[PDB]
Structure formats: C-alpha cells, structure tokens
Design an enzyme around this catalytic site. Structure first.
Site, PDB file in Angstrom:
ATOM      1  N   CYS A 113      13.394 -29.751 -22.196  1.00 27.28           N
ATOM      2  CA  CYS A 113      12.472 -29.749 -21.063  1.00 27.28           C
ATOM      3  C   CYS A 113      11.412 -28.664 -21.238  1.00 27.28           C
ATOM      4  CB  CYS A 113      13.237 -29.532 -19.755  1.00 27.28           C
ATOM      5  SG  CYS A 113      12.236 -29.784 -18.227  1.00 27.28           S
ATOM      6  N   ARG A 168      10.425 -26.158 -17.655  1.00 25.13           N
ATOM      7  CA  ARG A 168      11.449 -25.351 -17.001  1.00 25.13           C
ATOM      8  C   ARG A 168      10.901 -24.126 -16.272  1.00 25.13           C
ATOM      9  NH1 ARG A 168      15.500 -24.404 -21.903  1.00 25.13           N
ATOM     10  NH2 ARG A 168      13.721 -25.245 -23.095  1.00 25.13           N
ATOM     11  N   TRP A 212       7.532 -34.267 -12.329  1.00 27.77           N
ATOM     12  CA  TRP A 212       6.259 -34.946 -12.492  1.00 27.77           C
ATOM     13  C   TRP A 212       5.961 -35.024 -13.981  1.00 27.77           C
ATOM     14  CZ3 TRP A 212       6.345 -30.418  -9.368  1.00 27.77           C
ATOM     15  CH2 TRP A 212       5.960 -29.242 -10.030  1.00 27.77           C
ATOM     16  N   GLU A 268       3.213 -37.883 -22.199  1.00 27.90           N
ATOM     17  CA  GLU A 268       4.280 -38.870 -22.058  1.00 27.90           C
ATOM     18  C   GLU A 268       3.706 -40.260 -21.782  1.00 27.90           C
ATOM     19  OE1 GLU A 268       7.809 -37.724 -19.855  1.00 27.90           O
ATOM     20  OE2 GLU A 268       6.720 -35.998 -19.034  1.00 27.90           O
TER      21      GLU A 268
END
Ligand code: HEM
Ligand code: HEM
Ligand SMILES: CCN(C)CCN1CCCc2cc(NC(=N)c3cccs3)ccc21
Ligand SMILES: CCN(C)CCN1CCCc2cc(NC(=N)c3cccs3)ccc21
Ligand SMILES: C[C@H](O)[C@H](O)[C@H]1CNc2nc(N)[nH]c(=O)c2N1
Ligand SMILES: C[C@H](O)[C@H](O)[C@H]1CNc2nc(N)[nH]c(=O)c2N1
Ligand SMILES: [Cl-]
Ligand SMILES: [Cl-]
Ligand SMILES: [Gd]
Ligand SMILES: [Gd]
Ligand SMILES: [Zn+2]
Lengths: 401, 402
Positions: free
Chosen positions: A105, A108, A277, A282
């Site tokens: 991630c 974070r 979000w 992506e």
C-alpha cells in the site's frame, strides 16, 4: 539490522522493525521471489497475547492497571469457548495496524484516519447487503471519499463463513464470444459467469456494473442488485483532446476490496471490505492500458494520429500519459477524490520517515510501491526498501469454490 | 518443489528448476526480502573449478568423456603444484559468455552468444593495458555500428597485485564540485574526477568532459592515460520536433563500457575485464539525464515545453521525460549509432526468457532492474514474475581500489 539507502539523497537508515517479522515470506538465501504476486489448536492464544500487548504499548499503557486484566479475559474466553471477541477499540486499533502493515500500500500515510463499521453482529445475506450499502454511501460521500472498513463476524468452526464473492464491491462485467474475446473487463469474466449462473440478466456493453454475490454461512449466495444511485461513476474526458469523451470510457469512484482476509490477534475475518480512494495510475495505466484488461492504448494512439508503426516513436508512452491526464482531469471535474502517482509517492516517502522515528522502519514492497508509469521520476524508485510480514495484517485467501 | 512463475498478461506458467542449482547465496531470508538493495583454501577453489569444467564440457557435448576427466585431473594437479590454474582460451571465451548469460539485471541478454572476447591475459604493464583498451573501444564502437565485446586482463594470482581500471566505465563525463556545493557535469563521477586531478590531470570546466583513464598495474600506483578524442564517439542530442532542444547543448557517448566489475570463472577472479554492448535509451534519457542526482534536466525541459509545472496532476514530469527519451532515440538514429528502446529491448528479453526456459530450465532475473524506469507496465516484463539468484560464471561488484 538491514542497512537501507536512499540513492537520491545518500541517506542511510536501519530497519530494526524487520527483526520482529512473523509469518515467513517466500524468499530464501538461494533465490528471491519478491516479484511473485501470490507467494505460494493452542496457537490462537499466542497471536492473541501479542496483539493485546501491541494495543497497550500504543496507548502508553504497558505494565499496570487494565493491561494485566484484559490478558486474563481472553485467556478465560478461549479457555471456555475456544476463541475470543475483541473489544470494539481493539478491533479499531487492529484494523488500523493491519493497514499500517500492508507492504504493497502506497497510501499508508493515511493509516491513522480510518472509519471502522463494526458488523460483527451480522446474521444473513440481507444484513450484509445493507451493511455494504451503508459503507458504500459513507465512503463515497458525494465524491469526497473517506477511508472505511466494515468488519463482519469472525470465522468459527462447525459453521460456514461470510464471504463476498466479488473481488471488489464495484466491478464491471466481462462478456465472451464465439471468438472468446471479451466485451467489458477481462479481469472479471469469471465472476460475471457466476453472476449469470445465479439469476442476473447480462447487460449489453462495456461498463455494466456487476451485481453482488453475497454469501451468508453455509447457505448458497444470493444475488443483490446495486442501487444505480449508489454507484458513483466518472465519465472520462480529456482536457484538450475533444474526441476522448466519444470513446465512451468510464470508471467508478470507490475502490472497495472485498475478498481479502483481515487477521487481528489470531482471528480471521474472511469478509471485511476496505475502501479508500484511487491513485490515478491504477485506472489510467493498469485498468485501461494493461493488455489483459481494457487494452485501449492502441485505440487512443490512433486518435492522436501517433506513429504506431515503430516502437521508437514512443507512441505507447505518449498515449498512456494522456489517458492518465484524462483520468485525473475527469475525477477532478466530477469532484471525486483521486491522487496522482507523484503526490502519492511523495507522501509515502513522508510516511517512511514517520515510520522510522515511530517504529524503527516500515515494511514496503518496492515492486508495488513504485508506480507502473514513470517509476524513476518518483522518489520511491531511489529508496531501498525491506519487505516482511507484521501482525495484524491483511491476507489473501482462496476463492470460495 | 521448484518456484512456480506466472506471466499475468498471457496466463502462462513455468517452473524455475535452474534456481535449485544456485551456486551462491543472496541477501533475502524467509524473514525479509532485500531484493531492492542495489549492493546485496584450495578445496573450495577446486569445487568451483570442477563445476565450471563440468559446464564447459556440457556445452560442447563432451560431458563425462576422456578430455573432460583429463582436464579435471590437470586442474586438480595444477592447484596442488601452484595454488591456482590457467584457463584454456576456449574455456575463457565460454566463461565470459556464461557470465553475461547469468547476469540477472541485464535486459540485453538475448545477445549473450554474440560476444567478442579479447584475451589480454599476457598483459604486462599499465601502458600495454591502455593499448588493449583503446583497441577494445575502437572495435566495439565500430563507427556507430556497435559490437558487444569484453577484454580480459591477467587474473588475480598469489604474490602479485591486481590489474585494476579505477574508472567505473571506459567513457565517463567529469563531475566538478562547483564551489556552491553543486556539480558541473555528471555528479555520479565526482570521486573519480577528484582522483584524476590528484593524479596529475588538468581538469576542464565543461559539462561533458571525457575523463582520462586511471590504470593500475600490479603493485604499481595508478597511471593516468588520456583517451584519443577521435576514439570517443559522441552523439549531440536534438529533438525531432522541439527545435530549442538542440540549444540545451546536451550530448551522450556511444559506447557504454563497464570497467570496474570482477569476472569470476571457475573460481578464478579477473578484477579487470571491461565489457561493452550498446545503450538502451531509457538509461540515457530517463536515468542519466533526469535522475535528480544526475544531470537533473527534467524541470528545465518541462518549463521550455510550456508545461504547467506548479502542479503535479498535469503530469508535466511524465510528459517532459517522454520527450527526452524521444530526443535520445532520434539523436542516436540520426547519428547512425546503435540504440534500443525499452519496448524492443523488453520484447527481446521475453524471448530470452523463453529460450532460457527450454535450454536451462529457467533464467535468473532481477525484476526491479529488468522493468524499465518509465512505462513499466507498458512493457511485457512488468507482467512476468521472475526468480532472482546467483549462478557462476558471473560478473560481480568489487570494492573501489582506493
Ligand atoms: C486512502 C487512499 C489509499 C490509496 C491511494 C491506496 C493505494 C494503494 C495501491 C495503489 C495499492 C496497489 C495494490 C494493487 O493495486 O493491487 C494498494 C495496496 C493495498 N492497500 Fe492501499 N490505498 C489507500 C488506502 C488503503 C486502506 C484504507 C486500506 C485498508 C484499510 C488499504 C489496504 C491495502 C492493501 C491490503 C493493499 C495490498 C497489500 C498487499 O497485497 O500486500 N489501503 N494501495
Ligand atoms: C548488447 C546490448 C546490451 C544491452 C542493451 C544491455 C542492457 C543492460 C541494462 C539496461 C542494464 C541495467 C544497468 C543499469 O541500469 O545501470 C544491464 C545490466 C548489466 N549488463 Fe547488460 N546490456 C547489453 C550487453 C551486455 C554485455 C555485452 C555484458 C557483459 C559481457 C552485459 C552485462 C551486464 C551486467 C553484468 C549488468 C549488471 C548485472 C548485475 O549487476 O547483476 N550486458 N544491461
Ligand atoms: C486482483 C487485482 N489485484 C491483484 C488485487 C486487487 N487489489 C488488492 C488489494 C489492494 C488493491 C487496491 C486497489 N486500489 C486502491 N487504491 C484501494 C482499494 C481499497 C482500499 S485502497 C485496487 C485493487 C487492489
Ligand atoms: C554502478 C551503477 N549501477 C549499479 C550499475 C551501472 N552499470 C554497471 C552494471 C551494468 C551496466 C550496464 C549499463 N548499460 C549498458 N547497456 C551496458 C554497459 C556495458 C555493456 S551494456 C550501464 C551501467 C551499468
Ligand atoms: C509480475 C509482477 O510482480 C506483477 O506484474 C506486479 C508488479 N507490480 C504490481 N504493482 C501493483 N501496484 N499492482 C500490481 O498488480 C502489480 N503487478
Ligand atoms: C533502490 C532501487 O533498487 C534502485 O534505485 C534501483 C532500482 N532499479 C534499477 N534498475 C536499473 N536498471 N538500474 C538501476 O540503477 C536501478 N536502481
Ligand atoms: Cl481497480
Ligand atoms: Cl550509463
Ligand atoms: Gd483526424
Ligand atoms: Gd517545433
Ligand atoms: Zn527477496
């Protein structure tokens, strides 16, 4: 204590936190498997102690008062029942730590700001659907997205399990052919075949929001249509390429991961969907340009009149960047929260320095932190990283069939 | 019980049985992966040599024959009498190719069989070393039609110091620590630049000054040598449609020749064995020119392109770097100097992966180095899982001689 260097600045730090790693990863002294996506009863009490100890350390409350005391109830709880229930604050603190610990991630820096909807008192496939629906509404929040996780009951033996059959709450259909070729999203052709094989009438086109196959313990799943007013979507347009909108592209606003297994203090929640979000790459780079996804790269390049006859014109690179420009433009115009890969990676560097002084390091998976376009233009590219498993954590799990 | 490896773009699945042969150990453990780190007794000399000879006689399909056992005994006997042994010329050529073949961070390995090996093991001085190096540069550059080559200098051996090339590459641009704490030229080369000066070099003051060679003969101080200007082929950088780009005054050199790595073959060590191929455009356009700690031109290019640099979501960085890579490719093609773009190079590396899987049962690859530093998921290597491990023969890093 692994030495870790930043090659942009020349700074050195040591990852002392790595020394506390748990569930061993896939690498051995003889070969590295860091590029692999999915790498390959008295025990419940040990993971239980450790998490409780982690809880009271954070709240400045190690060694005294209730520290001793909460250790006993879980002792007695597992003594009589064989499992235990988490205090609502623990479930909150475990939820945030598991996010804090996710090596892949990049977001974070946000880990402290998370809304935990405790759904442990859930009891049917109709109950889930409303719990999911409160989540989707709360997280979407008219496009001002808010991080949220909803936690369904902890798996126990003798009875089945709550499990969302979709990888995400919002997914698009994938329809086959005499030639197999897919209209819509090729990543979702499987779950699309299970949605039809369960009642749903298949739509016509590329961006049909799939229904929801929700599954209460032991009983077979039930289809659930999603309220079209609950599914906030963004039509895709480009700030200067007027024809881009005519390509008819769209993507949804809320990325909500609904198949990972949340594990706190030794307890396994196979249904615990978290949402945050999007980072724009992506959608623009992987979802739209991956060869096995929507694979639009060449269609956009034709419209830009680019020279697709030679790789060295860099037409793929040019079209991809504009596709990302269109994603960012469209989400902002729709007033939907989105972050570009430059701002996101720069916040992650800030997160690494935060985690260094607080916990003495940070588990990070370099191959997933570096964004899929323009990697060396981001600071995380030049940052050496250490990857390991801390608890509590999110885990992948087998598909429920 | 061998690693299963998936290609996500196509769906295919293979198992890397070659990884089980891993002749050494890397930095990762089941606790922690360190794959992203940039820098991770006769009996033992004997088994290394034994394994290489096995390898050499397998490649020529004389596995386990008369000649094979003869060579084992010869080597066994020579380590007993002298402490070391000597490679035959054909063994040296095979070992240098295998070291290339085995290099896990090299994306150009589709070429590993086409390698010109210059045997310089009879080299005797720094001055002769300079002559072999100049011939290597001249042959490999070949007026822009680049040819892969390696020149192998005398091996490390007991009683004598090492041959070393102090420069990290044969062609490098000076980095002059300006008086503001800044750098003019290439900041990656400030240290070697300080050394050249300290060792008698009269420094220039441009951004693209080619460094002299510092060549060390055994048990001798390093000796400075200037490269003939007409041996060093350079490419002025222009852009096909941005005509102000030529006014930046940017250049890069044709021949990438890595000169500070150690070549290991059958337990023998060659501290000095420079090798050269040709560039992939992203090394120049993305890394050498755009890295914040290198030439760092990205912002000045984006300003000139009239991009909106006050906000990141305009993707100005991405747009400017794509145009820099276009200029690099255009300029090398204009100058008729070999260059490969990251799309062609990663496509050919996929074929190498397939060749290598049929040939050896796998291929050692460092994913973070094979995936280009721009447009990663647009190349097929991004969607290919990979197993990283160390095979011998091998190129290895080594400490700086100073
Ligand atoms: C708030 C903004 C956030 C952003 C921009 C963000 C971004 C990302 C991205 C780009 C990935 C790459 C993985 C992939 O694409 O498959 C990822 C992974 C992940 N994220 Fe986040 N994320 C955010 C919040 C969250 C939250 C709230 C959670 C959970 C509470 C979370 C948990 C995870 C997990 C578990 C992974 C996968 C880790 C692994 O597989 O090892 N993220 N994130
Ligand atoms: C012919 C065209 C070639 C191309 C396009 C090419 C490409 C590359 C690239 C892009 C890298 C990563 C380097 C960096 O970013 O700093 C690399 C690494 C490397 N290459 Fe190649 N290369 C070629 C030929 C060769 C040859 C002829 C040799 C040796 C005989 C070689 C051996 C290596 C080694 C040792 C590394 C570093 C691997 C490591 O550190 O583990 N390459 N190559
Ligand atoms: C199957 C596709 N991959 C392999 C896994 C999907 N996934 C795994 C969990 C992390 C992940 C993150 C995103 N995006 C996000 N920003 C977020 C989703 C939820 C909170 S943040 C999108 C997909 C995934
Ligand atoms: C020290 C900096 N990093 C760690 C490695 C730099 N290096 C040495 C290893 C391989 C390497 C390859 C290239 N490019 C090339 N195409 C080639 C160089 C030689 C033959 S092909 C450029 C630099 C490097
Ligand atoms: C094979 C390789 O590990 C795979 O393509 C990975 C690379 N890095 C990734 N990084 C992110 N964020 N998401 C991904 O799906 C992947 N895929
Ligand atoms: C820290 C990080 O591993 C480092 O910047 C690496 C990443 N990948 C790379 N890949 C290549 N080809 N060359 C490099 O120098 C690097 N640098
Ligand atoms: Cl997604
Ligand atoms: Cl270089
Ligand atoms: Gd047109
Ligand atoms: Gd122009
Ligand atoms: Zn590893």
């Amino acid at each position: 204590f692994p030495r870790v260097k930043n090659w942009e600045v020349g700074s050195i730090t040591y990852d002392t936190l790595s020394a506390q790693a748990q569930q061993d990863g896939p690498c051995t002294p003889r070969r590295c498997l860091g590029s692999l996506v999915f790498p390959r009863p008295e025990q419940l009490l040990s993971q239980a102690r450790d998490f409780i100890n982690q809880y009271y350390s954070s709240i400045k409350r190690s060694g005294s008062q209730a520290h001793e005391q909460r250790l006993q109830e879980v002792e007695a709880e597992v003594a009589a029942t064989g499992t235990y229930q988490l205090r609502e604050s623990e479930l909150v603190f475990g939820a945030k730590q598991a996010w804090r610990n996710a090596p892949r991630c990049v977001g974070r820096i946000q880990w402290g700001k998370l809304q935990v909807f405790d759904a442990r008192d859930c009891r049917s496939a109709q109950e889930m659907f409303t719990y999911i629906c409160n989540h989707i509404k709360y997280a979407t929040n008219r496009g001002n997205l808010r991080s949220a996780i909803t936690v369904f009951p902890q798996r126990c033996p003798g009875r089945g399990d709550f499990r969302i059959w979709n990888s995400q709450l919002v997914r698009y259909a994938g329809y086959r052919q005499q030639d197999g070729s897919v209209r819509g999203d090729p990543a979702n052709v499987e779950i699309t075949e299970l949605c039809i094989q369960h009642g749903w009438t298949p739509g016509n086109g590329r961006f049909d929001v799939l229904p929801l196959l929700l599954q209460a313990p032991d009983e077979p799943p039930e289809l659930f249509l999603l309220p079209p007013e609950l599914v906030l979507e963004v039509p895709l347009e480009h700030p200067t390429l007027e024809w881009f909108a005519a390509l008819g592209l769209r993507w949804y606003a809320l990325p909500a991961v609904s198949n990972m297994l949340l594990e706190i203090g030794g307890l396994e929640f196979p249904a615990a969907p978290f949402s945050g979000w999007y980072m724009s790459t992506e959608i623009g780079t992987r979802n739209l340009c991956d060869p096995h996804r929507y694979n639009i790269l060449e269609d956009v390049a034709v419209c830009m009149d680019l020279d697709t006859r030679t790789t060295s014109s860099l037409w793929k690179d040019k079209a991809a960047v504009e596709i990302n420009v269109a994603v960012l433009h469209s989400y902002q115009l729709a007033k939907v929260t989105i972050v570009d890969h430059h701002a996101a990676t720069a916040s992650f560097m800030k997160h690494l320095e935060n985690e260094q002084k607080a916990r003495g390091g940070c588990p990070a998976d370099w191959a997933w932190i570096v964004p899929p376009i323009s990697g060396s233009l981001t600071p995380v590219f030049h940052q050496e990283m250490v990857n390991y498993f801390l608890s509590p954590a999110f885990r992948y799990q087998p598909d429920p069939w």
